[PDB]
């Protein structure tokens, strides 16, 4: 039904939406429904939750405006089943486009303009970003891409507006997308035997333009391997884990078709905001982290591979409105930010070593 889908709805759905949102364990019951098949990797399992909500949108005078939502890489070894996770985000999200390219398949990835042979007339051809306006775009093989449609991708993650300057038309259009890339290293764990950069061919400013870099490892463990193997045999047949999923649905883990409508309703109704003591908390954390990069920077006699910028502070300040926009409340609280200190702090432990 997209584009021009249905917004307003009935009365009892408001009732049951106000009945789901009052549970104290909303974060757990959302972080157990995303991977009923993927074992392990609970951090990414947490990070998809704060990505499907979207941040705040501020149109403060002047003509400038800020953005939402955050952007996530998932670089790591094969066997992470990150591609199946991207198929899951394709199934959940209200609008979502899955392009594994290089452009795929007979459809390009950016906003190309093709003149109609009849009438000799310009029109917007399509692509990936323009069809998916107001949601999530998932990409495979972000390192192995053509590099002529790359400048537009490194523009549409920052100011949300793709520009066209061809021979006839000079319009500037909107794209409120939220990129979720997933690249692949060469030789695997030798990346973390090297410096944590040294994967993308050209430069590492790309790794500073993103927000939450995740790095997946693999360590052989016997009970872990028997657990994943016996788990996958339980996944196969005769879908006993799906029967168990039905007895989960009798108790918790609401639905897919309830989850989609819940994401739409929680997205376009509320608009959250913080409290200034949380702001002095976040200043009191970020200044100490930057000083720690100053002392680690001065002692280790070289420059760092993954820098820290104020975009990292802007990502930290958007995570709290993601989680408040889950909790449906207009204001923010202290533990309500400290959980994001734990999570982004786990991504800094992903970042440094």
């Amino acid at each position: 039904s997209i584009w021009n889908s249905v917004t307003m709805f009935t009365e009892e759905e408001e009732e049951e939406f106000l009945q789901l949102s009052r549970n104290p364990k909303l974060y757990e019951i959302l972080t157990n429904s995303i991977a009923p098949s993927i074992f392990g990797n609970e951090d990414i399992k947490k990070a998809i939750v704060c990505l499907l909500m979207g941040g705040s949108k501020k149109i403060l005078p002047d003509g400038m405006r800020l953005r939402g939502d955050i952007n996530v890489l998932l670089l790591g070894d094969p066997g992470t089943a990150k591609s199946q996770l991207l198929k899951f985000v394709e199934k959940v999200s209200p609008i979502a486009v899955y392009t594994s390219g290089k452009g795929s398949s007979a459809a390009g990835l950016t906003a190309s303009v093709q003149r109609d042979p009849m009438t000799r007339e310009f029109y917007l051809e399509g692509g990936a970003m323009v069809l998916a306006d107001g949601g999530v775009v998932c990409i495979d093989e972000f390192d192995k891409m053509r590099d002529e449609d790359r400048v537009a991708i490194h523009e549409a993650m920052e100011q949300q507006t793709i520009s066209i300057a061809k021979a006839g038309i000079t319009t500037v259009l909107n794209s409120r997308t939220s990129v979720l890339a997933a690249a692949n290293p060469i030789y695997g764990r030798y990346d973390d035997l090297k410096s944590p950069g040294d994967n993308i061919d050209f430069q590492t400013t790309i790794l500073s333009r993103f927000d939450m870099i995740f790095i997946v490892k693999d360590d052989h463990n016997e009970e872990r391997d028997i657990s994943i193997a016996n788990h996958v045999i339980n996944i196969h047949t005769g879908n006993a884990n799906a029967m168990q999923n039905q007895q989960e649905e009798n108790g918790s883990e609401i639905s897919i078709e309830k989850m989609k409508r819940y994401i739409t309703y929680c997205r376009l109704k509320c608009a959250p905001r913080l409290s200034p003591q949380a702001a002095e908390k976040l200043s009191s954390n970020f200044v100490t982290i930057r000083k720690q990069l100053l002392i680690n920077e001065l002692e280790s006699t070289e420059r760092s591979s993954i820098p820290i910028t104020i975009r990292q502070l802007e990502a930290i300040i958007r995570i709290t409105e993601s989680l408040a926009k889950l909790e449906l409340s207009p204001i923010a609280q202290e533990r309500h930010v400290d959980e994001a200190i734990r999570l982004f702090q786990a991504s800094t432990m992903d970042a440094a070593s």
């Binding site: 591609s83 398949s105 051809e125």
Partner: protein
């Protein structure tokens, strides 16, 4: 989307991966192909769905094929002791599937 020289109306002409659903396709000599084809073979093994967007049409056709390939080594029959990803001139993501 291309025209048809017998009948002048435009036709949505599906590919062979569109055409061979619930069957077996036959592709040979990988080393003489374009990137435009290689993105389509990578597409059909990725999520079993070819989507097209030119010109005035926006669909997702379904394709659940089964490919039997027929490769060809580089120069000599078996170049060195080196393994297959080193021996053939292909790439790793088409060898993963």
């Amino acid at each position: 989307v291309r025209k048809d020289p017998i009948t002048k109306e435009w036709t949505l002409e599906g590919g062979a991966l569109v055409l061979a659903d619930k069957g077996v396709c036959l592709i040979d000599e990988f080393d003489k192909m374009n990137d435009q084809d290689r993105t389509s073979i990578h597409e059909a093994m990725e999520q079993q769905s070819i989507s097209i967007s030119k010109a005035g049409i926006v669909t997702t056709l379904q394709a659940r094929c089964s490919i039997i390939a027929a490769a060809n080594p580089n120069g000599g029959r078996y170049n060195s002791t080196l393994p297959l990803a080193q021996n053939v001139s292909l790439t790793e993501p088409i060898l993963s599937r």
